[PDB]
Amino acid sequence: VRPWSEFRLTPAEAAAAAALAARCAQRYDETDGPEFLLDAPVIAHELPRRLRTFMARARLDAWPHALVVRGNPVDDAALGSTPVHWRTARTPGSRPLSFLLMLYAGLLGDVFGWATQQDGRVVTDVLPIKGGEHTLVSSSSRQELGWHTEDAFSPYRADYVGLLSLRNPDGVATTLAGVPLDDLDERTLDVLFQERFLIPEPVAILTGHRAAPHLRVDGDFSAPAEGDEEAAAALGTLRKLIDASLYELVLDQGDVAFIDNRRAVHGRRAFQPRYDGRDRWLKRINITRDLHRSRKAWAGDSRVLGQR
Ligand SMILES: NC(=[NH2+])NCCC[C@@H](N)C(=O)O
Numbered sequence: 001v002r003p004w005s006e007f008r009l010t011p012a013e014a015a016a017a018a019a020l021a022a023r024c025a026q027r028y029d030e031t032d033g034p035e036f037l038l039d040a041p042v043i044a045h046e047l048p049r050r051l052r053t054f055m056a057r058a059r060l061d062a063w064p065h066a067l068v069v070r071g072n073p074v075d076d077a078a079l080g081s082t083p084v085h086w087r088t089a090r091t092p093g094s095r096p097l098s099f100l101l102m103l104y105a106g107l108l109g110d111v112f113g114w115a116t117q118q119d120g121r122v123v124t125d126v127l128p129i130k131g132g133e134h135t136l137v138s139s140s141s142r143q144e145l146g147w148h149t150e151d152a153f154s155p156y157r158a159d160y161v162g163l164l165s166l167r168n169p170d171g172v173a174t175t176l177a178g179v180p181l182d183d184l185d186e187r188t189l190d191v192l193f194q195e196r197f198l199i200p201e202p203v204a205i206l207t208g209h210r211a212a213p214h215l216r217v218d219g220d221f222s223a224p225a226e227g228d229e230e231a232a233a234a235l236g237t238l239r240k241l242i243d244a245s246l247y248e249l250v251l252d253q254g255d256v257a258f259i260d261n262r263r264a265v266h267g268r269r270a271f272q273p274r275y276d277g278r279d280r281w282l283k284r285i286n287i288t289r290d291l292h293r294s295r296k297a298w299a300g301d302s303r304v305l306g307q308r
């Protein structure tokens with residue numbers, strides 16, 4: 001078996017989806033414009049029916065850590081070289097695939113971005129940046145990107161994180177782990193459900209159903225409340241259990257994954273960057289089931305969050 005739910009497009013389905021994305025790229029100026037933001041969820045209804053059925057049904061299954069869609073064609077010649085920085089990463093070659101990711105995303109919920117992250121962009125970029133190999137951000141490489149809940153610090157964090165692989169020639173693995181429910185004892189579990197952790201006022205790591213908890217943790221940034229040694233020991237145990245159950249998902253060129261940000265943490269294995277124009281490159285997007293949950297952080301009329 002596999003801990004994620006997987007769908008493979010037929011060449012015909014893939015072609016139709018790509019064709020729809022190209023039409024959108026033709027008619028709208030940008031993915032993040034107010035117009036396409038509002039229309040994309042409706043335009044997505046024109047995607048291949050088998051895909052729409054998968055996305056509607058798989059989202060409601062209780063078990064998977066992510067929804068994975070394989071088989072979108074990507075032409076390296078048409079795509080062009082991997083950008084050196086996210087600033088200049090909205091290349092014409094990657095433009096139709098950015099529109100494609102937002103269409104798929106519209107089947108799962110409401111897309112949004114952060115004012116403090118990549119200039120408030122909704123479709124963002126994951127690529128190695130020279131000089132930043134050993135950082136704690138997605139533009140790292142030689143240092144493994146440790147497992148984490150996306151934007152764990154915030155209550156406005158995404159329900160789903162979407163990743164579309166534009167290229168990944170060396171097969172660098174994304175990492176994933178669910179709640180280690182098969183090994184967490186009930187005392188530790190109880191403590192993880194209490195507001196005794198920092199990620200700043202204290203908050204909980206686990207919430208909701210005890211037989212299927214939601215997760216809010218960051219391998220690097222999580223800490224116990226000052227002096228709380230029971231909270232500390234629970235977090236220590238959780239680290240070692242997550243470290244031991246961490247598994248690999250390789251997003252090959254054209255693969256899209258929608259990681260369940262409440263069920264699973266994720267990261268990326270260390271890799272040696274090339275810096276020759278064909279480095280691993282993903283497009284990325286935050287999705288929430290309910291945009292109104294974060295109405296505090298609404299900058300204004302935009303879909304870009306910014307609290308104080
Ligand atoms: N490294 C770590 N444990 N946590 C921070 C991850 C930041 C990543 N989502 C980003 O760069 O957008």
Ligand SMILES: O=C(O)CCC(=O)C(=O)O
Pocket residue numbers: 126138145150163173174175266267268282284
């Ligand atoms: O590179 C990856 O596959 C993971 C990227 C990631 O964790 C992120 O951008 O939030």
Ligand SMILES: [Fe+2]
Pocket residue numbers: 148149150161266267
């Ligand atoms: Fe992440």
